[PDB]
Amino acid sequence: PARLLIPEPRAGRARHAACVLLAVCFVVLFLAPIIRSVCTQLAALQLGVLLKGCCCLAEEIFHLHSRHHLWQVLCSCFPPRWYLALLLVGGSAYLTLSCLCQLLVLALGLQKLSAVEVSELTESSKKNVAHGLAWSYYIGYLKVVLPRLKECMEELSWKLHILVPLGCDIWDDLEKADSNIQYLADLPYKHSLYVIRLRPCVLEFASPLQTLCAMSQDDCAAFSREQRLEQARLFYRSLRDILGSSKECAGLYRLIAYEEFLSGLILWHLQQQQREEY
Amino acid sequence: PARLLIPEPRAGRARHAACVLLAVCFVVLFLAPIIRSVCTQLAALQLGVLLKGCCCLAEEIFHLHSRHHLWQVLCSCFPPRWYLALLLVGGSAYLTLSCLCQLLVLALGLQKLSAVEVSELTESSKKNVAHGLAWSYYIGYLKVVLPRLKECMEELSWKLHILVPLGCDIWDDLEKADSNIQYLADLPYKHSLYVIRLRPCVLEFASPLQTLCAMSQDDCAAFSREQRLEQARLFYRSLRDILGSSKECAGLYRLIAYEEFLSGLILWHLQQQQREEY
């Protein structure tokens, strides 16, 4: 037949190989004050973690109220091995040239990550659902529906509106959630023309958030609600970045993102589109 | 209304902040042989890249014929700044304790990546389409179709077969690509009972590979065919890992993966399932 050739997960034998190499070099060099030199060199390498944490703090200043709400900044900047660095610094002291060396290392950009590390981080994390969901929602639905919609609009004689809720409940129907929404008609693939008490609109939810609604409440695999929020924000970011560079879909859509009535937001978007027409 | 609070891409100001800190410490310490000490310390830090490359080679031994086909191993193990390390080693020499120190660093596992670096690698790469595609194909299609299929099979009086082609062409119809396939009937969401010259089967393609067929030939955004192959392999891996832990779908399916007649593979899978029934 044809035998399948798929890659497998990493067994993790580089760590044991480094351990064996360490034991061999340790026995060869073994065959009393040198451990002081070893520990001082070790603190000299570990001080770069502290300088990297300072630089990470300097970048993560701007996103306190938007991404970290103060403890979440300091918890996320340096790695959680916090008790190692200052302890080894105190063991070495009781130099500044080493700090200058670490700055020269980190500023130039010679710590390129290798291909195996990048591939390991790709195959490791399963929490990258947003990019695949955005590309599936763009290709499978939007690129076919969107060019025909202006033709359907001329046959009925605006642009499509996509709801992006960053919450959880999607099954709230638009006539059921919002009171002022009244259904009008279809366009021959559901397309529900609505009127809000008093403007007409073409409104639809974004489907794959229900996917994110199903990865949480079913709980056959592990997932959390803060992860749902982060993935929904990343999905909106990816769909915005794709459709901003959309070739044929330049003026057929307008994304509407919100969190938690509801119809006044739609009125503000319609008023902003009307003013943008002027 | 409600102002949106979405994160933005990183401006990249930590590098300039490290540069300013370097210039300040450089001016303060400035106010002739010390640069030899600096360069020797720099080679002492850069030797860990060489040891890390040796460990990466030791792990990437096992995947030559399966992932790298010999130059692709050595190109992928160490970072592409190869001319830096040996040159600085030669500039420092013309010690082994530093090698022992680097081994003690890399074996214990104190180089934890921070949260900001992990988030930067998540938001950076757009080539993680496989996990989102697999979860969309599992939730949106399989979890609803698969429990009703045995009821439809009893109403017609086996299990569903999913084709996973790792090639490119999906539009080859099963009566058109394979000659021995004959259509029989449906099951009231297309479900085409087939007979291969001479066994019956329930066969269907996997849909979202056409998504990967559309991200390549349209070419509105950049994508390559080797990336199509790697993403298809990752998609098959993710779908296999999900459906192996599928709760209700434990005996309703069998994935079939291949590359490039075609019907003999289906005969071998049916014969293996028949022998597994015995």
- Between the alpha carbon of residue A208 and those of residues A138, A264, B124, B137, B140, the distances in Å are 11, 25, 22, 11, 8
> Helix (H, G, I), strand (E, B), or coil: what is residue A70?
coil
Name the one residue in this structure whose structure tokens are 């520990």: A39
Among the partner-chain residues B25, B99, B116, the one whose CB lies closest to the CB of A99 is B25
- Give the Cα separation of B68 and B62 in Å (integer): 10
> Which of A6, A103, A114 has its CB closest to that of B77?
A114
Quickly count: other Cβ atoms within 10 Å of residue B67's Cβ.
18
Length of chain A: 278
Q: Which two tokens stand for residue A242?
A: 């794709």
- What does each C-alpha distance from A243 to A134, A270, B9, B129, B218 come to in angstroms? 10, 19, 17, 17, 15
Q: Write the DSSP assignment of B197-234 as a string of letters.
A: --EEEEEEE-TTHHHHHHHHHS-SS---HHHHHHHHHH
The arrangement of strands across the sheet holding A160-165 comes to A181-183, A192-196, A199-205, A160-165, A253-258
Q: Using the 8-state DSSP alphabet, how is residue A162 labeled?
A: E
**B185: Cβ contacts below 8 Å, ≥ 6 apart:** B156, B193
For residue A252 the two structure tokens come to: 């057929």
Provide DSSP, chain B.
-------------HHHHHHHHHHHHHHHHH---HHHHHHHHHHHHHHHHHHHHHHHHHHGGGGIIIII--HHHHHHHS-S--TTHHHHHHHHH--HHHHHHHHHHHHHT--PPPHHHHHHHHHH----HHHHHHHHHIIIIIHHHHHHHHHHHHHH---EEEEEE-SS-----HHHH-SSEEE--------EEEEE--EEEEEEE-TTHHHHHHHHHS-SS---HHHHHHHHHHHHHHHHHHHHT-STTSSSEEEEEE----HHHHHHHHHHHHHHH-
Element (H, E) at A164: strand A160-165
Q: Under 8 Å CB-to-CB from A124, ≥6 apart: which residues? A: none
**Chain B environment of A88 (Cβ under 8 Å):** none
H/E stretch holding A192 reads strand A192-196
Burial class (CB in 10 A: 0-12, 13-18, 19+), A188: exposed
Given a contact cutoff of 8 angstroms between Cβ atoms, the answer to whether A13 and B58 are in contact is: yes
Extract the tokens encoding A212: 């994110």
- Looking at the domain that runs over A129-277, which CATH code has it been given? 3.40.50.12100
Phi, psi of B93 (to 5 degrees): -75, -55
Q: Do B114 and A257 touch (CB under 8 A)?
A: no
Strands A192-196 and B160-165: unpaired
The pairing of strands B192-196 and B199-205 is: antiparallel
Closest alpha carbon within chain B to A104: B22
| CB-closest option in A81, A101, A134 to B41 | A101
Task: Pick B116's closest partner by Cβ from A41, A76, A106.
Answer: A76
Are B1 and A268 inside 8 Å of each other by CB? yes
- The answer to whether the beta carbons of residues A146 and A249 sit under 8 Å apart is yes
Secondary structure letter of residue A193 according to DSSP: E
| Encoded amino acid at B35, one letter | I
The closest CB to that of A132, out of B34, B128, B247, belongs to B128
**What method did the depositors use to determine the structure?**
cryo-EM
Cβ neighbors of A57 (< 8 A, separation 6 or more) are A73, A74, A77
Residues 6+ apart with CB under 8 A from A103: A51, B18, B21, B22, B25
Q: Are B231 and B214 in contact (CB under 8 A)?
A: no
d(CA B118, CA A106): 17
Breaks in chain A (C to N over 2.5 Å), named by the residue before each, are 31, 69, 94, 157, 188, 197, 260
Number of other residues whose CB lies within 10 A of the CB of residue A172: 13
Nearest Cα neighbor of B208 from B177, B176, B163, B250 is B163
| DSSP run (H or E) holding A222 | none
Is the alpha carbon torsion for A145, A146, A151, A153 positive or negative?
A: positive
Residues of A in contact with B95 (CB under 8 A): none
A136 marked as part of a ligand binding site: yes
Residues 63-92 of A with CB under 8 A from B: 63, 66-67, 75-81, 84
Q: Which residues pair with A182 in a beta bridge?
A: A195
Residue B75: list chain A partners with CB under 8 A: 115
B125/A120 Cα distance (integer angstroms): 13
Helices (H), chain A: 14-30, 34-59, 71-77, 85-93, 96-108, 115-124, 129-137, 143-156, 174-177, 209-217, 225-244, 263-277
Question: Amino acid letter at A170?
Answer: I
Sheet holding B160-165, edge to edge: B181-183, B192-196, B199-205, B160-165, B253-258
What distance in Å separates the CA atoms of residue A247 and residue A267, rounded to the nearest whole number?
A: 28
Determine the Cα–Cα distance for residues A124 and B241; give it in Å rounded to an integer. Answer: 13
Contact A132 B127 (CB under 8 A): no
One-letter amino acid at B54 equals C
- Element at A246 (helix H, strand E): none
Q: Which residues contact B265 (CB under 8 A, 6 or more apart)?
A: A1, A2, B256, B258
Q: How far is CA B78 from the centre of its chain?
A: 20
Give SS3 for A259: coil
- On whether any CB of chain B is under 8 Å from the CB of A255, the answer is no
Any idea where the domains of chain B sit in the sequence?
A: 34-112, 129-277
Task: Report CB contact under 8 Å: B22, A107.
Answer: yes
Instruction: Kindly report the number of other CB atoms within 10 A of residue B72's CB atom.
Output: 14
Q: Tell me the C-alpha distance between B121 and B115, whole Å.
A: 10
Residues of B in contact with A97 (CB under 8 A): 29, 34, 37-38, 41
CA distance A157 to chain B (A): 32
Q: Annotation-wise, does A190 bind a ligand? A: yes
Q: Is beta strand A199-205 parallel, antiparallel or unpaired with respect to A160-165?
A: parallel
